[PDB]
Amino acid sequence: KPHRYRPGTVALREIRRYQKSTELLIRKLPFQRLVREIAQDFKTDLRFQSSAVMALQEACEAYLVGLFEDTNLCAIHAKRVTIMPKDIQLARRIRGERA
Amino acid sequence: PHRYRPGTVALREIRRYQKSTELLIRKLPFQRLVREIAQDFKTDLRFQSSAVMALQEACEAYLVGLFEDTNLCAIHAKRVTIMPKDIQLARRIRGERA
Amino acid sequence: RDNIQGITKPAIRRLARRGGVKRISGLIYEETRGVLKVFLENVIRDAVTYTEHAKRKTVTAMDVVYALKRQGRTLYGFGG
Amino acid sequence: RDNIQGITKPAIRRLARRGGVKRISGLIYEETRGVLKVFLENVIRDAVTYTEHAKRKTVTAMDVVYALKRQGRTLYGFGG
Amino acid sequence: KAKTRSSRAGLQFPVGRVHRLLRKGNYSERVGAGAPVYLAAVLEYLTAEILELAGNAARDNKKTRIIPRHLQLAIRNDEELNKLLGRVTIAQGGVLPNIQAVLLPK
Amino acid sequence: KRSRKESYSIYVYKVLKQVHPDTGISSKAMGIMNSFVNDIFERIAGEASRLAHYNKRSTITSREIQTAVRLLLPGELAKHAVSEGTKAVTKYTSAK
Amino acid sequence: KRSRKESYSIYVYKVLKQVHPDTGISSKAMGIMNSFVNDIFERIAGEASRLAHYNKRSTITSREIQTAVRLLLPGELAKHAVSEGTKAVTKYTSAK
DNA sequence: GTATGAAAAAAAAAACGCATCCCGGTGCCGAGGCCGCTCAATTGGTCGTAGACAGCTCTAGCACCGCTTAAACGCACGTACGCGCTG
Ligand SMILES: [Ca+2]
Ligand SMILES: [Ca+2]
Ligand SMILES: [Ca+2]
Ligand SMILES: [K+]
């Protein structure tokens, strides 16, 4: 027969799941290609220690995770539950990341 | 008798103080608050008047800043009136408080 | 009272005006005093710590300047 | 090109989940890519700048570590 | 016979002083003769950049003499100087005039 | 007979009279400018110091300064600074 | 012919076996601990360096370290650290 | 759907008044510039070593390849959240 969890019940489960864990959440290659792509702009025919790329990924994920925590609060502060661009922008504007 | 609508003056005040740079806290009450707080860390302490002035420049600047940020948080909630929870958010995001 | 009340409602209103605030909840005036205190506590503590290290009895501007730099709130026009 | 699309919707969802986000506006997935790019740009630029100063053609972990320290986003466990 | 290093480098800023400040500031064991010139220049350039803009802000206020507020206005209105002096408070600087749109009347 | 307090104020005047010969500067402003110089001096020196340290080199050369400047100043401001620096070193090595 | 890379890892083990003799530590964790030591070392040294500079003194003494530690560590952590530091210097000067 | 009048809501027009901008007008003090003293930068010579350079060694970073399966993608559905409106 049918079974269907109400909208949000899974999201919450996912939250608990990923907070419990420490594994990197972006796929390792697509990231590595994005790194080299961005590094080309500064100098071509560049090589990277695999550890160097991993460090960049640890930093990135950590940064974003953090930005989201802050964003979430901004969303909630507006009596919402759904994060939206303007929430991120506020968080960065206050963090002093942007003007 | 003549009476400006609530907010018309507030706006005028905004324009007035943004235009100017003079310190907005009364110089003595501040100086006493400095010495009062310094007692806690060590008694029979003296202060260069310049040292006190620096603390005041820093303080006002800091607060003015915190308010700008607070204001945005208030507005972000479809409000115009800043409230404690607005400040708290601003500091929580600034990483001033947990 | 002590001196923290010396930071008058109208003075806070003034600061928040320079911050471009239009309307201020009554609760804010005490909230601000508390924050202001926390600031001065953290800055002065360090300033005095510099004073003590110099074996001085007199807090210099520089003591405050050096202290604020540590707190990531650098100040221009009082030296260093 | 645009490996920035390689940063898949579901991967961003995952990150925001670890951030304790429950519901995510469609617009956010592009917004995030942009922010992420700006981050990597700023960090890598510096990393490479350290690489170039060492007259190397190979970006080391340390290059990234030193770079992040500059940006005030210190990283532990890559030889800090 | 003897001329200032500043003169040879075509600078106002004291190459000699800077070279000393570097040795006496526990920055490194030894200080290249090139270093202090270069540094002196950069400091000179930045000084000019700010003064040019402050000097403009002062002409824009019918004042002969630059005051703090001028230096602030100059810095906070130039995208790049703002970003450089992002964590700096300028004594008696005031803030840029700015009233959030939604706060204005209709 | 008071104790000589060093200051960049004479060099700020000289540079001011270049960029606006018909413009002056309040003591307070001049204060801010002195702070500004000392601040960015420490910033560049510091980053140069580390650059040397990181590369197991004992000596801070104009190379380290340049790299520091590229790291510390934003785009346009960096380009200009670097030029002025390179220009000045070039001019000094050629006047021996 | 390998690089001969120094590390605090042996001193972290020794201290670990004191505080929890029946527990060990993943290489990755040990990495983090090495980072941690180096970070706070640089922090304290740095603040000590400036302390000396600011007070026109050429020499970094245990006094400068203490002051640095009082400035850098929060309340309880500072108290403890200072004590352990004072204790350790006292113990060393008295063991000639 | 042509013509209806009755209020409701908005828009414009005409006046009462406070604030703000300009001025020209007067005095005060700090900005500005000069003078003498001094010590901090410059000079010219000696010495020690940092590091640039070439020659060599082998790390580990690149590319490639095929297999399995986990994750990405899409589409369909329907709820509950955002968001406007009201008192
Ligand atoms: Ca602008
Ligand atoms: Ca006149
Ligand atoms: Ca010579
Ligand atoms: K290699």
Numbering used by the authors:
A (entry chain K): 37 to 135
B (entry chain O): 38 to 135
C (entry chain P), D (entry chain L): 23 to 102
E (entry chain M): 13 to 118
F (entry chain N), G (entry chain R): 30 to 125
Question: What do the study authors state?
Answer:
Eukaryotic DNA is packaged by basic proteins into chromatin, which consists of repeating nucleosome units composed of a core element of ~146 base pairs (bp) wrapped around an octamer of four different core histone proteins in 123 left-handed turns. Here, we present findings from cohesive-ended dinucleosomes that self-assemble into lattices composed of fibres with uninterrupted Watson–Crick continuity of the double helix. The offset pairing of dinucleosomes in an open-ended fashion yields uninterrupted continuity of the DNA double helix from one end of the crystal to the other, making the lattice like a fabric woven of chromatin fibres that are interdigitated with one another. The chains assume open configurations, in which the DNA path zigzags to form two nucleosome columns on either side of the fibre axis, permitting dense packing of nucleosomes by virtue of the staircase-like fibre profiles that foster a key in lock style of interdigitation.
Nucleosome fibre structures for the 349 and 355 constructs were solved at up to 3.4 Å and 3.8 Å resolution, respectively, and in both cases the asymmetric unit is a single dinucleosome repeat. In spite of differing by 2 and 4 fewer bp, respectively, in the shared and paired linker DNA sections, the 349 nucleosome fibre is analogous to that of the 355 in that it has a zigzag configuration comprising two parallel nucleosome columns. Instead of the fibre axis running between the two nucleosomes of the dinucleosome repeats as occurs for 355, the 349 fibre axis runs between the repeats, which stack with one another in an offset fashion within each column. In this regard, the nearly planar 349 dinucleosomes are canted along the fibre axis at a roughly 45° angle, supporting an alternating arrangement where each dinucleosome is paired in turn with two different dinucleosomes of the opposing column. Moreover, one face of each nucleosome is stacked against the face of a neighbouring nucleosome with which it is connected DNA-wise via an intervening dinucleosome from the other column. In this way, the 349 fibre is in essence somewhat folded and is thus less extended than that of the 355, with an average rise of 30.3 Å per nucleosome. The intrafibre nucleosome face-to-face contacts of the 349 configuration involve histone-histone and histone-DNA contacts as well as divalent metal-mediated interactions. For this binding configuration, the linker histone globular domain sits at the nucleosome centre (dyad), where it interacts extensively with the outward facing minor groove in addition to making contacts with both linker DNA arms. Given the close proximity of the shared linker DNA arm in the opposing nucleosome column of the fibre, the linker histone globular domain in fact makes additional contacts with this element of the juxtaposed dinucleosome. As such, the on-dyad linker histone mediates internucleosomal, albeit intrafibre, interactions.
